[PDB]
Symmetry: D2
Subunit: 386 residues, 4 copies
């Protein structure tokens, strides 16, 4: 009954099930989890692997000696469980030194420190076998207009990512970068606030082939945007390197609900798209078990993430395989959308009198699109009424 | 007292002061304006020029004979007033044939018709001396998930813009295209919903140098985004070809208030940015005089657009020239943001022990950014308290 | 298979399936429907009844003679089909005279005209057997701060509703009023913008027992509010006289999607609440078939409204009847929420040392709420995985 | 130059300038402030008084002995400075025991504990001379639909407030309660989410005269609502007992910016309303100095709160005193809005043929409202261009 296996490629951040429940108005409600027990519990639930910030695994300020001991304990748990580490990232947001950003801090010495902290963790990520390195610039931004010249900040952001790209190519590392956008919180406005802004920025880097996006369901929805549409544009550009799955109820603070919560129909269309397009990367959950929950609720919440993906996967597959849906797709002319507008070329189009001079505009306008019948078949499939 | 002259490059769409006041719930409250009287009245107000949709100037369905007479009347009014036409665009949204889009309609024959309708108006725009041709894909989108395969739609959108680019280069026209993003309305979700999505899409076109963005204040604010930040990224990419100025009160329907209304502080930071960066294109107002107004209120509203720009221009210039503000900018290290993070290169950075091993993280964290004092000086300048 | 019957009390506005598809940017895509054919088609679909604005049934400006003929045709169709008319309302928003409002227009003569137009339709509504009279003040509001003194406007709004209440009591009519809130559109801000504001206003009227609320799914969601929570407060106050069912995708223009579209999980919790609380009024759909659709799509969209309600009704009933869910409700202490905090009284509470002096705050804090397991059971029931 | 004095009645929460800068993603950037030094520094800035949560003044878990010493130190600083304490409140949100709420927690023993914790602080507030006791139910709410039966929760909320009202009347205390609404954060949805919901709830309490609202600028704007409109309705109902002043940039997390930041024009219309209506309560700032700031930035931010109020007060007064504005108000018929619609009564209205039968609807519709000229005069006054 919708049981995950490591072949489903479900992954979790250490910081997700490990979130102690401290929010802007309240103290932690759960004790800290040992990264080793998180790996063990996730493996029993059917997870494929885990991800980490440097500071999740190695407490900030650790000596090189303690650092080695933390990695060895972690590596032993991975060996014992068969869990993989497909992605890693840097914490450039918790420590007070990053209060005005890491890569785009106004202070130059902070920017240099941020780069050195990142490079150190890239080495560790490669050693653990990570294939994607995520950058979430949570402190890159501003609360007021004069605090940040955004053109200069984008220069600094490009400089930082270009240097990271020079570092991985000079070391011969087989790792790629993924930028994770977020529109706001904790800064009043964050630089590169949506998937689109991040995709546009990547095209200005020196080695654009090394960089893609790591979109998160809830973050695009914090701007009221259609997440499946944004994912489709990232896939269209060949830039969907990784994805963060969770839930969000509209435009408000970043909720990080378990996947399937929040906008359920958007979750259906997302799974339909990822499975149809053959996305083969990790299905990563960046979620927070609500601070109302004890540790039993943490693992129930994590299990629910994977369960909801598998239920939606089944429903989307039944939707696409239904002959009546295939009939409805043709009635709405989805087949015609996939055909070129003018494969005959510009000159043939200009000479084609049926495209303008003799085009019956009233007859074309009278054709219904039959979209509502199609959408109700999708609803019926989602709800199990077909 | 803040009087505009044609040297200020203020322009208005015919459809702005010409809006009759029909909204989704109500009939028109004003009679239609002759395009010739709009040109005359705007010239008396100090405007530099006007813009038009094809269907604003030539009523849909006009014969070639009536078309010639409409253009000649319009050209005579331009000659009589000295008004310019710096931009033109196509109406691909009003007629029922465009109910599922123009360039990305599911029906192939509609897509071909949309291209022919656009090409015809490009010829006219060039004849009138327009330098920028704007495309607002208001019907390109969907209300439901299955109605539009977004990857196929982006293929169709790229095909359409590539064909337009082939057309202007083969004709030898000196005109460039600007895509105007909008996140929603009238479609449930519109393709290329923000400046970022449009910038990313442009980089996939065959001749990207021909295409830029035409951002609108209110449209980015309909996604809760920081409009000056988005403009800065467009300037950083070299893609700000045109701009639509107006006002918007938050995330809701597209209000198109007169410029300066809505988010007043964002308007200040926008003008500061455009003037500092030396933007030399038209200051175009895409606004709607509220349907509460008679024709006297229409011209008062249009005059207010230009007045508010000139007041904000004065205040932003006083802000940047104030020695105390220049002192505060250095106190907040805006000068350091403009300096390279690592002009010494990657290897020097890796060997620099002051960037990590010997970096005093507690001393750097204790430095205040002094952003609040800087922002209050900006407030004082905006309010005329300095 | 989820077939509606008139016993389900599904009703539709004439203006819903009759919407011609004119939006702020486009002309109508469908021809006008005769109110008589709408009644016939809805009856065949299983609807219980219809609702109307005065101007939906009797074209504005009609003579008393034409008025009588329009009512007689309509009454004959009701007799032929068995359809009821449970609710009626006034159009105080389409005609230009209402551009600054009806009851709160700045012009006194418009306010008097608005009252007379309303009173005339109350008489007709009573004659047709309507039990609820809805008031949606779509033009009561402002785009700018100085245009409307809101305290004076609330005086005028109270005066108007008090006069309507005096009229129905003096005539001996058995009809009640329901105020329909909306936060914005077509005005920049609308007075009484949410269910809460309307409930508070009602308590200041001379005869508060005559007035309740007519909340609409999409309107509360245009403020990002939880619609089932707002309905619960209206039920708690005894003021849910009527309800408008539809769908909305977040904070944007009023979409009026078919019910079940938009926020699907909120639709589930709404149906669960209405059915558990024993709401016995009409299930009214205020929706607009998208303008992409021809007339076949209109009736498919209307049928989908009722189908989705019946599917959700089945799923919510299975959720509440599931013994495992009843167990989970007790594990989350929903039973304790229903028990008085201090039925022993204030003095016993003050003397109860187990409530403070000897309360084990750490042991209470450690109890998990088990909310995530409960919410996943709700998800499983909604998706038909149980 | 816009200097505050204690006669301006500016007050600050201890938790405002005392905020250490811990946010959901980052550690504190400032050390804790002694409440005594906050009182001294605020007095030097011209503040009138301070407010506190119980846990701001007396650390949680303090013995009665330490409690007495904390109050005595605080009282001495008030005596030394002349600072007043006009308002106090309870922290029912930080400690883990309150993770599912205080007054509406599902666990009955937590609800009883919450009441006892509140009653203890009411005694202290009265001893310090507070006139208003604020309740912000930050944890009263839910992240999921089944976790909270909202009708039962409203019963529990009414029970709690009724008991507090019985307590203050039985003790003979001269204190009133003010409910502070917030739509979300830290809960997914918070009960009584707006001013309207809180006003409606108050009317169901046993002694409604004891309860009013404490609206906060940013909280109503988190629902996209017009804050001056909501304040006007609270004033109209006689329920504006207190107010929280700050700034917010649209629909997102609760920013608590200094007053005047965020929506500047809404701040102008708010001050215009408070001063015109003769609001005589405290001008309380509930704001957070951004965590980018050191302690010098904290006091600059607090000073900016008061400065911006005084500048806006001057501009609103000049606006209302300008003869040209008074002329424009009559041109827009604000005088007619203040006059009764039908002081002649219902029967005279029904017999008045000029209100309907002979009303010239086309002539009334043609009248412009002149709102745009009025709004530009307001803009000119705000910007100091008049
Ligand atoms: Mg998130
Ligand atoms: Mg993430
Ligand atoms: Mg617009
Ligand atoms: Mg525009
Ligand atoms: Mg609606
Ligand atoms: Mg409605
Ligand atoms: Mg706040
Ligand atoms: Mg507050």
């Amino acid at each position: 009954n919708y049981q995950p296996t490591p072949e489903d490629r479900f992954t979790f951040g250490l910081w997700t099930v490990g979130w102690q429940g401290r929010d802007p108005f309240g103290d932690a409600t759960r004790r800290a989890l040992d990264p080793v027990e998180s790996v063990r519990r996730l493996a029993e639930l059917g997870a494929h692997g885990v991800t980490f910030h440097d500071d999740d695994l190695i407490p900030f300020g650790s000596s090189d000696s303690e650092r080695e001991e933390h990695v060895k304990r972690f590596r032993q748990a991975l060996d014992d469980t068969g869990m993989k580490v497909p992605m890693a990232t840097t914490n450039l947001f918790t420590h007070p030194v990053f209060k005005d950003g890491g890569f785009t801090a106004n202070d130059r010495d902070v920017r240099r420190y941020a780069l050195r902290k990142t490079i150190r963790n890239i080495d560790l990520a490669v050693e653990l076998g990570a294939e994607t390195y995520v950058a979430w610039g949570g402190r890159e931004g501003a609360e007021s207009g004069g605090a940040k010249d955004v053109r200069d900040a984008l220069d600094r952001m490009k400089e930082a990512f270009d240097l990271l790209g020079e570092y991985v190519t000079s070391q011969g590392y087989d790792i790629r970068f993924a930028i994770e956008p977020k529109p706001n919180e904790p800064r009043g406005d964050i630089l590169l606030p949506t998937v689109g802004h991040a995709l546009a920025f990547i095209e200005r880097l020196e080695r654009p082939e090394l960089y893609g996006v790591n979109p998160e369901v809830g973050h695009e929805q914090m701007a009221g945007l259609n997440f499946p549409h944004g994912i489709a544009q990232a896939l269209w550009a060949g830039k969907l390197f990784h994805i963060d799955l969770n839930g969000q109820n509209g435009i408000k603070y970043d909720q990080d609900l378990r996947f399937g919560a929040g906008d359920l129909r958007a979750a259906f269309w997302l799974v339909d798209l990822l499975e149809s397009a053959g996305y083969s990367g990790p299905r990563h959950f960046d979620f927070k078990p609500p601070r109302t929950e004890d540790f039993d609720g943490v693992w129930a919440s994590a299990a629910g993430c994977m369960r909801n993906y598998l239920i939606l996967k089944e429903r989307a597959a039944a939707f696409r395989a239904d002959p009546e849906v295939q009939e409805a797709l043709r009635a709405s002319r989805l087949d015609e959308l996939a055909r070129p507008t003018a494969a005959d070329g510009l000159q043939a189009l200009l000479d084609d009198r049926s495209a303008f001079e003799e085009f019956d505009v009233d007859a074309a306008a009278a054709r219904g699109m039959a979209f509502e019948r199609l959408d109700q078949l999708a609803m019926d499939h989602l709800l199990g009424a077909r």
